[PDB]
Design a protein around this nucleic acid. Structure first.
Ligand SMILES: [Mg+2]
Ligand SMILES: [Zn+2]
Ligand SMILES: [Zn+2]
Ligand SMILES: [Zn+2]
Ligand SMILES: [Zn+2]
Lengths: 212, 134, 138, 56, 110, 376, 146, 46, 47
RNA sequence: AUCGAGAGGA
DNA sequence: ACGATCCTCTCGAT
């Protein structure tokens, strides 16, 4: 029987043949089986990565350090956009633990399996096809881990290979002919500022202390 | 005076050549939608809250607003205001971490909403020094 | 630039009208094949028709923009060699300075209409500090 | 910073006035002129680091 | 700038990209995450069984990161974790995952 | 620009889809006021608002049929309302307002804001474009068509000359509003009533010794004697359910200026000919491509027309929150604000034209003047 | 003494431009830091840092000045110690520091563990990564198992 | 002589209290300036 | 590669394929803030 | 202090 | 998909 000619439509897999959509759930099965020798031939590693993993079971949750707070305030609140989107998510997620075991109604489930998938795609990205997002406190648009992670002024590019740093300084500059080539006239007030941790030593103390 | 620097008669600077004034104004208001939470302009001092600024307050009288002929500079508080959260948490603007001058005029009005309003102006005279552009 | 200004926008129709009341055989009754020497007319990017002898028509228009009976804003362009006549009343068009020249002169050649005459009456208005820019305009 | 040359260790000479002062002829590699160009300074914290700057 | 550790010190020499087995996710957690709120249980100010904390670092610059103490200037945040319901795709994966099927086949999956 | 907003424009925006299921008329406008909470209504003076972060803006009064206010309107300093507009020199120093100050700005919360002219490509213009190599179409005459008094329904018609040089039989097609594909002109021409192979050519080629051009068209005519009739021209654009649909498009969105009413059919055929005439003048190299950088085929949108693109947009809102206290009345409800505050936000930011953001209007039209030096 | 060359001398109208040095001469020597990153803050206005850009790095590498790159990329700026599982390469650890206690639950590892050293921004990313369902396994020996 | 505010428009030595809010003595303009200070200031005339 | 143009996804296909990063690259040792196999870091030091 | 928008210095 | 570096500053918002 067969392999459909498959289609991406939003966040769903859709097939022709010779139309049944691929419910999220379908695809877990599969892989949950597929072979070891099948994996690997194509890119996988028994222990470190498996196609069933490629799809979402359970979603970790990033602790505060990753997404924290406060404001203009004190008594009146604070938060980043992951705590907000890391809600739209624990949000619809109980909207569905509240149907299956409470009020249960056939084709009006799936209105809300796309929410829960959708916010879980959004919490990871949103500069894609169709709708971006926004409010439900700030307006726009949004946040996402990805753009945090993304090119320039974003982690890796802007915080890891290029950080802002201590003991530095900056001014205007001008030329002065009675200075030797390898010198640099540092103005005083700055020298009064930047510091160099020296270690105490028989050798230095006398001078050293007269500084302290 | 190379690769475009130029040399200036420090004598004639003194006589007053290329001098300027330099005012800068700071601003403040009181609260938001509170039926019981209202910033207050005052000259603070702890009162269970104790997060007040590194710098000095003693240049503010009681309305919490420096007087005019007063010379400020450093991290000096120019406008004391406290915001009570449960209590007297400081929240008062100090002068630029770099500027220094003299208060010139201080204004006290209000906004559409019957709001307490303040705009403090500080004046400095800046003199053609070494690195200045022209 | 110093002397630049910008269209603010008039109303097309009082002209449209004037046009259809001075030749400008309108479009519908158009017969391209039995009247090719037809400067076709254009208003605000619309084709309202045609016109034989558009010449005897512009003059008139110009005298009417320059006397003041048609807004001085409205631009009046007659392209001779492509047989079109575009009249613009759009808003947001920049435009400008200048004086006029019509050879309008008796004892000799092509001249500027202006003269020490007007200009001296213009300064007249500098020391009494009724001749404004605008009177130059009209 | 489009060279190694836009960076180089120098010898400090504290002075009055508030401009980083430098030698004409060390201009090019920086590509500075003096009609306002601004310039950064960093300060090594390890004895090694000091070495790395003064030697390489 | 943080305390003595008994632990030793190593330099990084290998990095293993790889993925998330729900397996570990709930093996590795401390979280449960049962409610979608941040902290107010009837104006009551503290944290909650819900979001941001049931064994997780803090705010009022306080040490209760689970007998962990040392707090927010040494609390490598420790992970939360949350069971979903009926599974879901994973965005930057859609397109390999579409390619995976245009590659395996139905019902037995070979 | 401003004056001719107020003075005229404004009043015309308020008359329109204005009417209800209620009829506004004369809008009335105040020299700027201010209602401080708990109080009379003061007379507002520029220097005064620059100081207490008030908005030099005046009162919006509408004369509503079976006297009434809907918002306020930021006033262009030194415009016909700004009290500074009639002021003597010594009258000025008096209001503490510099007499060298030339005004031309607004004042919103003490910050003087300037509306930045905006440059854009004119409409209702005829434009031809040779298109690249790697493309089948080879020239295209186009028109960003849309109405001067009434909306901003934006409707772009293209007349592409599918077929590069030589590449077999150069056919001509066009483009239409909410529609499926292109159209060989001759249908369309038949569809506007012009039917005879050649009563058509007149609408295009204007002199008959121009075989060259004629011939250029020899192959269009041929994509159509598969249709020799009004009703089956209208046909091809999908019975009676979908004929209609076309007798519309070819009145409501096909060349909207000109008109949208009933019988103005030939008024358009002719045009469409005109388009094609230049489209072909340009393909036979008798005449040059159309230069996209002629200042003459662009406009600057000053402050009037901007306040204008906002005022409509909110006046349509106050207008329709109202089709709503009222929908729910069955058995004054106006939210003034919407407007008196929408205006403020745009004038206050730079997101020219409310909430959504979208309005990458983004110009940050509205900036904070500059005042380092007079000449700036 | 007279000057050998005659000179150009005259009145010429000159301009004083905003931009005076004393309003620029910021200098930092360790100060406040952001909340997220733990990196110094932007702006002299708040005693920030200067950006030692991707670009200046290239040049340090150019010179061959390794150690200095670490110092600048770690000791000034982010720098942070984290513990790790000596098995399941993870920031899954638990500093019950004091009570010489270590554990890596589940893994149940109590003797295979690691204190290591990285840019706090590092840890971040990794957590960010993890929180996007990916493992950034941290291994200790130049060694792959074979 | 013991002073506190001064409204701007007319020039009256007002001096009033936390809670008579703001406004003048028949010249109502809520503006109001802060006096001068009295620890008289020393200038270097340089 | 991360340290350049398409960053999030190189991270993902890296995630899925279980790439094992050597960490012999300047770019990556800068990320873990350790010495670089560079001039000063190319040899080792002993006794 | 996070965020978006324009203005300016090389 | 990218797109000079660094740089100081002002206005406005859930
Ligand atoms: Mg220069
Ligand atoms: Zn902890
Ligand atoms: Zn199969
Ligand atoms: Zn572990
Ligand atoms: Zn008075």
């Amino acid at each position: 029987n067969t392999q459909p000619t498959i289609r991406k439509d939003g966040l769903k897999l859709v097939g022709s043949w010779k139309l049944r959509v691929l419910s999220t759930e379908e695809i877990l099965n599969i892989f949950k089986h597929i072979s070891v020798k099948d994996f690997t031939s194509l890119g996988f590693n028994e222990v470190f990565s498996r196609p069933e993993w490629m799809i979402l079971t359970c979603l970790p949750v990033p602790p505060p350090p990753v997404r924290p707070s406060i404001s203009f305030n004190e008594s009146q609140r604070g938060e980043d956009d992951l705590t907000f989107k890391l809600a739209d998510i624990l949000k619809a997620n109980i909207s569905l633990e509240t149907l299956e075991h409470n009020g249960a109604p056939h084709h009006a489930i799936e209105e809300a399996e796309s929410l829960l998938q959708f916010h879980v795609a959004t919490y990871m990205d949103n500069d894609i096809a169709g709708q971006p997002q926004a409010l439900q406190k700030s307006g726009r648009p949004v946040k996402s881990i990805r753009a945090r992670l993304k090119g320039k002024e974003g982690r890796i590019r802007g915080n890891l290979m290029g950080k802002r740093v201590d003991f530095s300084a900056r001014t205007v500059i001008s030329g002065d002919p009675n200075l030797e080539l390898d010198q640099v006239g540092v103005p005083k007030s700055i020298a009064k500022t930047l510091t160099y941790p020296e270690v105490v030593t028989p050798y230095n103390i006398d001078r050293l202390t007269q500084l302290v | 005076n190379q690769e475009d620097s130029m040399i200036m008669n420090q004598s004639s600077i003194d006589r007053g050549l290329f001098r300027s004034l330099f005012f800068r104004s700071y601003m403040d208001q009181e609260k938001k939608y509170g039926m019981s939470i209202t910033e207050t302009f005052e000259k603070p001092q702890r009162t269970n809250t104790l997060r007040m600024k590194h710098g000095t307050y003693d240049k503010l009288d009681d309305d919490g607003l420096i007087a005019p002929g007063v010379r400020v500079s450093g991290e000096d508080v120019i406008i004391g205001k406290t915001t009570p959260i449960s209590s007297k948490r400081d929240a008062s603007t100090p002068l630029r971490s770099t500027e220094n001058g003299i208060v010139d005029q201080v204004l006290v009005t209000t906004n559409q909403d019957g709001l307490k309003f303040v705009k403090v102006r500080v004046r400095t005279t800046k003199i053609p020094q070494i690195g200045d552009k022209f | 630039s110093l002397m630049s200004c910008i269209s603010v926008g008039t109303d097309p129709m009082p002209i449209i009208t004037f046009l259809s009341e001075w030749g400008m055989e309108p479009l519908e009754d158009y017969v391209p094949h039995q009247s090719p020497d037809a400067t076709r007319v254009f208003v605000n990017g619309v084709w309202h028709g045609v016109h034989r002898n558009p010449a005897r028509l512009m003059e008139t228009l110009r005298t009417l923009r320059r006397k003041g009976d048609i807004n001085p804003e409205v631009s009046m362009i007659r392209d001779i060699r492509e047989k079109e006549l575009k009249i613009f009343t759009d808003a947001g068009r920049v435009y400008r300075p200048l004086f006029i020249v019509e050879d309008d002169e008796s004892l000799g050649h092509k001249e500027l209409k202006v003269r020490k005459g007007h200009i001296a009456k213009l300064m007249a208005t500098e020391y009494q500090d009724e001749y404004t820019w605008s009177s130059l305009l009209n | 910073s489009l060279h190694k040359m836009s960076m180089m260790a120098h010898r400090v000479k504290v002075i009055p006035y508030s401009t980083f002062r430098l030698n004409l002829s060390v201009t090019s590699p920086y590509n500075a002129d003096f009609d306002g160009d601004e310039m950064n300074l960093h300060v090594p914290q390890s004895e090694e680091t000091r070495a790395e700057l003064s030697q390489l | 700038g943080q305390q003595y550790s008994s632990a030793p010190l190593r330099t990084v020499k290998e990095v293993q990209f790889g993925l998330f087995s729900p397996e570990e996710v709930r093996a590795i957690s401390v979280a449960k995450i049962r409610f979608p709120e941040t902290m107010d249980e009837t104006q009551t100010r503290a944290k909650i069984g819900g979001l941001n904390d049931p064994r997780l670092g803090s705010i009022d610059r306080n040490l209760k990161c689970q007998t962990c103490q040392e707090g927010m200037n040494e609390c490598p945040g420790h992970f939360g974790h949350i069971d979903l319901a009926k599974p879901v795709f994973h965005v930057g994966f859609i397109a390999k995952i579409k390619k995976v099927c245009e590659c395996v086949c139905m019902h037995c999956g070979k | 620009s401003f004056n001719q907003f107020v003075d005229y424009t404004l009043q015309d925006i308020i008359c329109e889809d204005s009417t209800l299921i209620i009829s506004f008329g004369k809008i009335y406008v105040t020299k700027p006021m201010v209602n401080e909470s708990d109080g009379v209504t003061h007379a507002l003076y520029p220097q005064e608002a620059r100081l207490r972060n008030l908005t030099y803006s005046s009162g919006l009064f509408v004369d509503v049929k079976k006297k009434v206010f809907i918002g306020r309107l930021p006033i262009m300093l030194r415009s016909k309302n700004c009290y500074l507009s009639e002021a003597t020199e010594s009258d000025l120093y008096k209001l503490k307002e510099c007499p060298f100050d030339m005004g031309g700005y607004f004042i919103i919360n003490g910050s003087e804001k300037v509306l930045i002219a905006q440059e854009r490509s004119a409409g209702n213009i005829v434009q031809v474009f040779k298109k690249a190599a790697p493309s089948p179409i080879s020239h295209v005459a186009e028109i960003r068509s849309a109405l001067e008094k009434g909306s901003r329904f934006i409707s772009t018609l293209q007349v592409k000359l599918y077929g590069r040089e030589g590449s077999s039989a150069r056919t001509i097609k066009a483009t239409l509003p909410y529609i499926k594909q292109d159209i060989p002109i001759v249908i369309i021409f038949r569809a506007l009533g012009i039917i005879p192979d050649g009563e058509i050519l007149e609408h295009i080629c204007y002199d008959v010794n121009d075989w060259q051009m004629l011939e250029m068209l020899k192959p269009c005519v041929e994509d159509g004697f598969v249709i020799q009739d009004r009703e089956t021209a209208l046909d091809f654009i999908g019975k009676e359910k979908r004929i209609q649909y076309a007798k519309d498009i070819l009145q409501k969105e096909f060349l909207p200026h000109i008109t949208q009413l009933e019988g103005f059919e030939s008024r358009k055929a002719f045009f469409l000919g005109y388009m094609i005439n230049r489209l072909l003048l340009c393909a036979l190299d008798r005449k040059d491509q159309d230069d996209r950088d002629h200042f003459g085929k662009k406009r600057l949108d000053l402050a009037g027309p901007l306040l204008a693109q906002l005022f409509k947009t909110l006046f349509k809102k106050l207008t329709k929150d109202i089709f709503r206290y009222m929908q729910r009345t069955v058995e004054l409800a106006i939210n003034a604000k919407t407007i008196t505050s929408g205006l403020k936000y745009a004038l206050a930011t730079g997101n020219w034209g409310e909430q959504k953001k979208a309005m990458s209007s983004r110009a940050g039209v509205s900036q904070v003047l500059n005042r380092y030096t007079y000449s700036s | 003494k007279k000057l050998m060359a005659q000179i150009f001398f005259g009145p010429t109208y000159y301009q004083r431009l905003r931009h005076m040095v004393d309003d620029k001469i910021h200098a930092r020597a360790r100060g406040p830091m952001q909340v997220l990153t733990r990196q110094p803050v932007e702006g002299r206005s708040r005693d920030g840092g200067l950006r030692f850009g991707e670009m200046e790095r290239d040049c340090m590498i150019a010179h061959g000045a390794a150690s200095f790159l670490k110092e600048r990329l770690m000791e000034a700026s982010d720098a942070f110690r984290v513990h790790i599982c000596g098995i399941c390469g993870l920031m899954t650890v638990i500093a019950k520091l004091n009570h010489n206690q270590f554990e890596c639950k589940g893994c149940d590892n109590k003797i295979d563990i690691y204190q290591i050293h990285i840019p706090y921004a590092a840890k971040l990313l990794f957590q960010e990564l993890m929180a996007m369902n990916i493992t950034p396994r941290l291994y200790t020996d130049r060694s792959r198992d074979f | 002589a013991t002073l506190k505010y001064i409204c701007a428009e007319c020039s009256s030595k007002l001096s009033l209290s936390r809670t008579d809010a703001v406004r003048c003595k028949d010249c109502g303009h809520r503006i109001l300036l802060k006096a001068r200070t009295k620890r008289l200031v020393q200038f270097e005339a340089r | 590669r991360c340290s350049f143009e398409e960053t999030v996804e190189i991270l993902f296909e890296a995630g899925a394929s279980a790439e094992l990063d050597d960490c012999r690259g300047v770019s990556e040792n800068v990320i873990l803030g350790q010495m670089a196999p560079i001039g000063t870091g190319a040899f080792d030091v002993m006794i």
